[PDB]
Structures are given as structure tokens and as C-alpha cells.
From a paper:
The Dot/Icm effector LegA15, a 471–amino acid protein encoded by gene lpg2456 of L. pneumophila Philadelphia, harbors an ankyrin repeat (ANK) domain that is known to mediate protein-protein interactions in eukaryotic cells. LegA15 is a GTPase with a unique catalytic mechanism, unlike any eukaryotic small GTPases. Here, we show that an ankyrin repeat containing effector LegA15 localizes directly in host lipid droplets (LDs), leading to Golgi apparatus fragmentation of the host cells by hijacking the host vesicular transport factor p115.
We next solved a binary structure of LegA15 bound with an unhydrolyzable GTP analog 5′-guanylyl imidodiphosphate (GDPNP) at a resolution of 2.27 Å. GDPNP was well defined by its electron density. GDPNP is shown to bind a positive-charged pocket formed by Arg291, Arg408, and Lys367 without inducing a large conformational change of LegA15 because LegA15 in this complex is well aligned to its ligand-free form [root mean square deviation (RMSD) of 1.0 Å]. GDPNP also makes additional interactions with LegA15. The guanosine hydrogen bonds with residues of Gln353, Lys354, Ser368, and Tyr400 in addition to Lys367. The γ-phosphate of GTP is anchored by Ala364 and Gln356 via hydrogen bonds, while its β-phosphate hydrogen bonds with both Arg291, Gln356, and Lys367. The α-phosphate hydrogen bonds with Lys367. In addition, highly conserved residues Cys361 and Thr362 possibly interact with the γ-phosphate of GDPNP through an intermediate water, which is in a good position for a nucleophilic attack.
Author numbering: 19 to 460
The structure:
Amino acid sequence: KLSAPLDMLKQMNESTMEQTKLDELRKKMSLQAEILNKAKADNDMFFRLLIELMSLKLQGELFKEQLSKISKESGYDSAQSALIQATNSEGQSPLQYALQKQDFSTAKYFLDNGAKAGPIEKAVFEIALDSKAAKEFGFPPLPPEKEKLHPVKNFGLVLGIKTTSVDGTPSQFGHIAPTYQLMTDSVSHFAKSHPGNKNFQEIANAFQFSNEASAFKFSTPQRNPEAGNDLARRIQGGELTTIPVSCKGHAMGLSYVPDGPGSKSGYLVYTNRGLGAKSSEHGTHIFRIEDSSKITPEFINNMTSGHSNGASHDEIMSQIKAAAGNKEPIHHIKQKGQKNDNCTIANSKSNIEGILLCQKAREVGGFDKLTESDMDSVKKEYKEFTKHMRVEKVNELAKALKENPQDPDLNNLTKEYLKQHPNADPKLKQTLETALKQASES
């Protein structure tokens, strides 16, 4: 019956390349482009035409003909030339784009036309494999081996290290379940080492509640209807509640901060530092919620299952705006842009700075009444948290590297950290350099 899925997996594996090989291929085709000395290709035009083409939902053969025309119209010799070289402003190749959108028919046509699967394409594919669209295409469930967080992602996502494991696994894209668990542990560990910090007792309690009630497996919540009933009830009772939120191939940040226990008003804190947000809006947005009853079980079920149910960014975003009465946010926290990552750590963690802001606003009686020193206090506690999380992960990395001094991944993670964070606290650098020295010991 479903041999198309088997065929696509075969193709994806035949077309696999290491990143450096794929970069060579691309660079060599750039040299050939310069020999011909024809006009420069227009990637933005290609993707515009590509996205229009995909929405027509054409059958394979017509699709492939149209794909040839728009490649040429965009300045490429062929569909294959465009497929191997074009990237959009998010840095996605066409194949990455089709997989991120869970458009497996288009992804397979791209493969038929010679598109290559580097480590990033394969990671985005594995994420897209855990979705209703993947099941309906005939794919099986992911093997349970892939449930564990790869060490290159555990350290890579927390510490911000871009690298690839020796086995091909990039540090960038992660499933929701193990990354939400890692956030829940990081927040809880901080809360426990700082019992006088009342804010973080609330935050740890909220993550623990949502982490358990959502019961993600890979990137699909496992008790969809009930979980949203639980979270909505917690919000209705006026308790700080986090809301795991995703769309196709992307995770955002979302939480509800109550005015007080049993209150009906509070704030909805939304974070997106990456795909789908304009660079000017990268960061965290705080909406005033006058009546929490608009944060319904259905809304929350839609938020948590956004990726598995194939919701688009605009569908999720519009529901978030609806729950806030389509009013504009009252505050924006600008936060560093991210690209080529589904932000399972980035958006969840940066959302906490918005939670802390709202906790301060609550206690001084409103956003009206925040002073400059209040908001510098907020930023100071947020940075105290992210410092704690960073220091523990560097110590964990040094420890791991000394107990397995010959592992290529631990060594390369350690080296790449120092290379990519030159301005790192000297105590962090010291800890990792001494670990690297120790490792070179046979």
C-alpha cells in the first residue's frame, strides 16, 4: 500500500550529505555560475513563486513542470540548481521549507528533482515525522531510540553551540518532550537552590504542572483534550500557568500570569524569537487579560498540539490574539533573534523574563506603576536565572568530558563553545579549558 513513504525515506538517505560536503557542492556550483556569468539568481523571487506554486495543490507532473519554469524565471538553470542552492530569509532550503510545512508530497518531488538532505534537512524531517500529516502520508511512528535528547542537542541548545555530532546529528532542532523536560528541570533546580525566591517557586510549580499535564511524547501531547481542561482550570483558579505552544515545525513560548489567587484577570505572555516573527518583534509580548475565561480548554489544546495537528504560525498567532480580545500588547521585551532552530529552549526560556516582568507588575499594582529600578530588578533576576542555567551546563559539560575524555562529541562541543563564545565569563572558559587539558591525557 504505502510504498511512497518507504521510497521517500530511501531517497532522503541516498541524498544525505555531511554539511561540509553539501557546502562544497554549493560552492562548486557557485564557481560554475560565475563561469557562465549570467544574471544573479533571485532567491526571494524563487521562494515567492515556490510558495504560490505549492498552494495550487497540483499533481506531480504539472508541479514538476511549473517548478522548472519558476526556477528559470528566478535565474537558475534548472529546478535541481535552484533546489540545491536557494535559501529563504529564514535560512531554509526549499526541501527544509517543505518538510517544516509538513508538505511531504512537495518534499518528495524536490527529492525526485535532486534536492540534497544535509543534517538540518534531516533534523527538520525527523521533527515533521511526529505529526498527523506524517501518519496520514503513511509514515510509521518514530523509533523509541529517538526519544532521548542527543548530547549535542542537550549541550548545544542550552549553551548555544552550533555543531554536528559525528553521527550526523545537529545540535539545532529538538523535540518538544525532552526539551520541555529540560526546561522544567532547569527551573526547578534554580527554585530549589533559591528557596527565598518566591517568584521562582511559582515558576517551577507552573512548569512542573504543565510538563506533566501535557504529557508530550516527541512533539505530540498524549492526552490532548484533558490536558487543556487541566490547564484552563488552573488558569481559571488564578494560578501561574505555562502553555506549551507550537505550530508546524516551530515552538513558541506562552504563559498566563494571574493578578492574584482566584482572580479573573492577569497577563498572557507570548514569546517568539524566531521563525514567523518579524525581526523588529523578536522577543516577548505581554497582553493584558481582563477576563481569563477567554483562555479556553480548546485554545490550550490547540496551542499544545499545534505542531502535531499541522497548525500554521498565523493560525496559532491569530488564536492567541483572539484570546487577548484582539487588543495590542501592553509591553514588548526585545530579545535576540534566532534562526534555523525551532526554539524549543530559546522561546520557553526567554518567556520567563516576561513572567518575571508580570510578577513585578502584579506586586507594584500594575504596569502603570513600574519604575526604572523595578524593571532593572526584573532583568537582574532573569539574568541570575540564565547565568545559573549556563554555569550548571558548562560544569556538566566539563564533568562529562573528564569522565569520557576520548569522546569526539564532548571534545568538539567543548572546543566549539570556546570558539563561539569568545566573550564568555573567564570562569566558564577556565573550567572548559582545564577540562580539555585533562582530557588530553590518554
